[PDB]
Amino acid sequence: DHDFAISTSFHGIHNIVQNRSKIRRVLWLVVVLGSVSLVTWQIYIRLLNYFTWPTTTSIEVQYVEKMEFPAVTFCNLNRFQTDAVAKFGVIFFLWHIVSKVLHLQEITANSTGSREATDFAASHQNFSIVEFIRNKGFYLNNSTLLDCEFFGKPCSPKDFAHVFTEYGNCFTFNHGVSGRGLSLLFNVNQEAFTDNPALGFVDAGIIFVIHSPKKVPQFDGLGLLSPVGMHARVTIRQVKTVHQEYPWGECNPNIKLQNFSSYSTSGCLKECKAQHIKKQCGCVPFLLPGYGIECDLQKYFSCVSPVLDHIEFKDLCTVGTHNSSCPVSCEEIEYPATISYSSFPSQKALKYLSKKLNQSRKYIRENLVKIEINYSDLNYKITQQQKAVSVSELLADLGGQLGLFCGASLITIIEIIEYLFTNF
Amino acid sequence: DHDFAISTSFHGIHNIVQNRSKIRRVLWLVVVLGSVSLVTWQIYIRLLNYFTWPTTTSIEVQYVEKMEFPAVTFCNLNRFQTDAVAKFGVIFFLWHIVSKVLHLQEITANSTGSREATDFAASHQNFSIVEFIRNKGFYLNNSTLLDCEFFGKPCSPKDFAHVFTEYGNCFTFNHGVSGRGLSLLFNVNQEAFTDNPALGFVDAGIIFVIHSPKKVPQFDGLGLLSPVGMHARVTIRQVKTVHQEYPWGECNPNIKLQNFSSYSTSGCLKECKAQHIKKQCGCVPFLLPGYGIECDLQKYFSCVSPVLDHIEFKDLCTVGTHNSSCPVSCEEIEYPATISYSSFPSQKALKYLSKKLNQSRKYIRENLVKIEINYSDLNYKITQQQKAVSVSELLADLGGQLGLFCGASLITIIEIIEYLFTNF
Amino acid sequence: DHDFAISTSFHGIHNIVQNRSKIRRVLWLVVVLGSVSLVTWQIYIRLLNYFTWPTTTSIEVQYVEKMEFPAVTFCNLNRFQTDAVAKFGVIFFLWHIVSKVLHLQEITANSTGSREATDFAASHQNFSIVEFIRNKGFYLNNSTLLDCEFFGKPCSPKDFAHVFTEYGNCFTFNHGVSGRGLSLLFNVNQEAFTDNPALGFVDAGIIFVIHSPKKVPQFDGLGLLSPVGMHARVTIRQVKTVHQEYPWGECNPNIKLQNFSSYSTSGCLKECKAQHIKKQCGCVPFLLPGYGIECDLQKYFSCVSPVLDHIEFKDLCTVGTHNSSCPVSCEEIEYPATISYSSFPSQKALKYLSKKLNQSRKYIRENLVKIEINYSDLNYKITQQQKAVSVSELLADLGGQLGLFCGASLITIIEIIEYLFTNF
């Protein structure tokens, strides 16, 4: 009988009855009660905290012998060749309507431009807008990209690749060491290219964005700028972040895009919009790369624009937490940039360039742009979200907290359970 | 007797005397001594570390369906209408003296401007500087704010609110989704507004600062800029930080401002200066919003400037740690910004704007400013300071460290104490 | 006999044989085996994790009553006085060759400039390039530094110190409170200074870099810029980072530079290059401060440039991890900066400055530069790499994990070992 109380190896209270004294027995019983009470309260609290799925983050800065230079893409803030637009003004509103897929900016209904564009779309059903923008848009050529070098190696227009964005033709670089970097000298040729000011496209200069090669450029007002007549120096540093899965973080690794190119939030949004629009129309706008047939011009007014309006009005596409349609990615790469400027044509260099290009000194100040992109002296930086706890970690805390007061362990718990099993 | 050594549940050494052997008894005594010696040393060390009140910080990045756009405020780098200042030059030095409350920049004594300003203040005692600056300062009007939109919705001058700063009249916006943001097109009208160059106000352009709506703008050289004739794109991302109380961090939540608008370091400085000045003079400079009566002009020279000089000399107002007069706030919101530029009037748009405003092409280049502020694609970032330890955490470590060597617990400590109590 | 099993204070299973029952004995043996099996597996795992030398990083933001303003250095983007270069064009290629030590940019062999420079070097062996660049380079003077102030105190050209960089003469400031800072107004005098455009030096403006006073400026494309005719405002905040030693982090504190000025990565690279070159030639290029004799001009072509080519081609000098020749420093200071601009000469101030300097209005727009550098409202930020574990920490985890299941301690391990020793 007494062996049950005397043999239970938990520190507990062996002398509850073996003390053979009233005061000692009462004290021992009180201790036995209180120790386990505190232990169970603490363990309940600890389990409650665990069920919150806590996390912690860490910051580290690595460096490598050599590193990948992120891809860059460029576009001209004047989107159309002047002659092709001189007698064809409706093109502005046509392109605006077609680009609503990306820029998501509402058009005043029954506006003169909208009315004329609708009339033209009703008339010239077989007209090909995409071919027009490809042929008559911006273009890279010895007459446009005067100079360009990369880590001391010359590069040629053939090295770039074509891309479509709301600004028309856009060109990427490096598509799929400190100090050194990419250097360029554009000739925006402001007299040859033009744009509608009434639509707000008033500024002149080069708009470019930095992105990882796997990505598709975004722009939509997030791209950087560079003015005419000033040499702009841009310094960048790679930044990488990691997120934990939804139970702890917000990523959902299991989702995959129809292109199957891993995953990317903007790609998820594009695919979602393509999927939605395909239901309401048998064709997909070509600005979304390869989801199906390109719609005839009239379909843009007939179905596309109302569909986008409805999508935004009902928030059928969203990003952010796992509850959103396109949750955050497991891994992401950002390239923060800082900028500084210098007057590009110096008086001494101005005449030299004028002789080189057989053009007036006014033209040089009013047309040329020089850009330089370099890695900073500190190469790399990473942010990582840690799993604050797993099953083992909680058990480690459980044992220490349990042993703190009661001076017990799982073996003692098993022994106590064995004693209970006989009584039950 | 022997039950005391045999029954003490602490692992220790039960066989100190029960071993019935010299070597075993000596070994057991040595073990019993050494285990507790190491345990007590470790526990003392750990208590010492705890009394340092350690802390750790974490970084996280959240996102929401929609977010609040921070308030923005603007001012003109030319502060006074040209005609009102043409025959009234003393106004420059008068305003400088009055603004010493904010800009805290010393004035060379007995300077011609200072002498003339003192003479005028002695003469025109009843002159109202504040009314003058309100009436003749900068102003928002269809002639000044040519265009402005907010998330695609047009906005009108009536949407702004008036504010006083060292630059005279200043206007706020949004006072108390990615890509989209605020767009503006100012007409600085450099011919109509003017400023004293001898005082250093040589540059022309728009100066603005970004702050949470609850806050009061600061400027004092911390505001951003935007030049004339260039379209400036500004991208921002909300950053939030939290600090622990003085025993761990530096915050002192218990301090409350007389306006009772929660707390803010700059507000604390303003209130402290108002309190100090009110003692030495029955009136408070109006640039401090609502602490009492506004002082007559002469009082600025009589008391205010010497009082400010004394304040700075004796450091009667300070910020930073809890020892400072205005300690750091518990919660803070900052909006870091990056900037890039483009030439604003394009050759094609230049003529259009000239026709629109019936003004020369030179005027357009020399007067207009265009600004755009957008949220970045990543919305939110927060920094939080964690309590590295509370009472429970130290106890958890205490039990594990104690159990490591001696294999004991609080229950054993109680049992050991009970044995000691009988002997005592 | 039975005392061995009954007396072993480890919770384990005292009743393996004392149970006097088959089922109880089997259960107790199973428990004794399983508890220690799990414990040993967990302890092995934990030792494995420890041997990874884990680390964690923390971020904190402190503030002080006053703080040290970092040193700044400036250079002119036009490097040579126009007259001295008018009839001496070979100087451009000569300086390019000599500066190859720093800019590490390859020269096209047998180029006309290279041929003529080699001819001159063969002819004028005793010509002193360093004296030439010192005398005829950029210079600070009342004719060049029109104005400059520091925290409200006027400063004079005598306060700067001379330095040599690839841009020729360069001047430092502050060499070995919020809002207030450094203000300057340069006169680049674009007519008096000039540079070769064919070498790419086309832009005009001021190039400057921010560094701690102990450091030597780097430039090499990492320096900031500021254009002509625009007032540039620069805001900075001090950032400090701390790294752990190679076993945990990447620092190797034991390495010391020959100058013994503590340590710095760029200093390590400079010293390494000097050491390598000194072997292949008895003289060291003067751009490396004080490592020995300066080489005669011909030696630059004879030995230096081939030696640099070989160094780069064999990566004999490297930075980064401890495996690299110049590992990361233990402590580093960076000064990230953000920039904004305003049109410098306002119409009202333009005439005033023209009268002040007796120069045409065109000159003022085409020659003057204004800069201002200020500390942000948040002073200081530090990043620290923590030792995730020491010997004591692992022992703390070891005891808790051991006590979790087996309910044992080192004392029990000693008792078990004592029992084993007798059997052995």
Residue numbers in the entry:
A (entry chain B), B (entry chain C), C (entry chain A): 38 to 213, 224 to 471
Sentences from the paper on this structure:
There is, however, a conserved architecture among other members of the ENaC/DEG superfamily. In this study, we used single-particle cryo-EM to determine the structure of hBASIC in the membrane-like environment of lipid nanodiscs, confirming its global adherence to the canonical ASIC fold. By determining structures in the presence and absence of Ca2+, we identified a single Ca2+-bound, non-conducting conformation of hBASIC, as well as both conducting and non-conducting conformations of Ca2+-free BASIC, revealing unexpected Ca2+-dependent conformational changes.
To reveal how hBASIC responds to Ca2+ removal, we prepared grids of hBASIC reconstituted in nanodiscs in the presence of 2 mM EGTA to chelate ambient Ca2+o and analyzed the sample using single-particle cryo-EM. Following extensive 3D classification methods, two predominant classes emerged, each containing between 15,000-20,000 particles. In accordance with the electrophysiology data, we observed two distinct particle classes that differ in their pore conformations, which we thus refer to as ‘EGTA-closed’ (class 1), representing a non-conducting state, and ‘EGTA-open’ (class 2), representing an expanded, conducting state. In both the Ca2+-closed and EGTA-closed structures, this ‘glycine gate’ is impermeable to ions, with pore radii less than 1 Å and ~1.2 Å, respectively. EGTA-closed resembles the Ca2+-closed conformation whereas EGTA-open is dramatically reorientated such that the positions of the L425 and N426 side chains are switched; N426 now facing the vestibule and L425 making contacts with the β1-β2 linker.
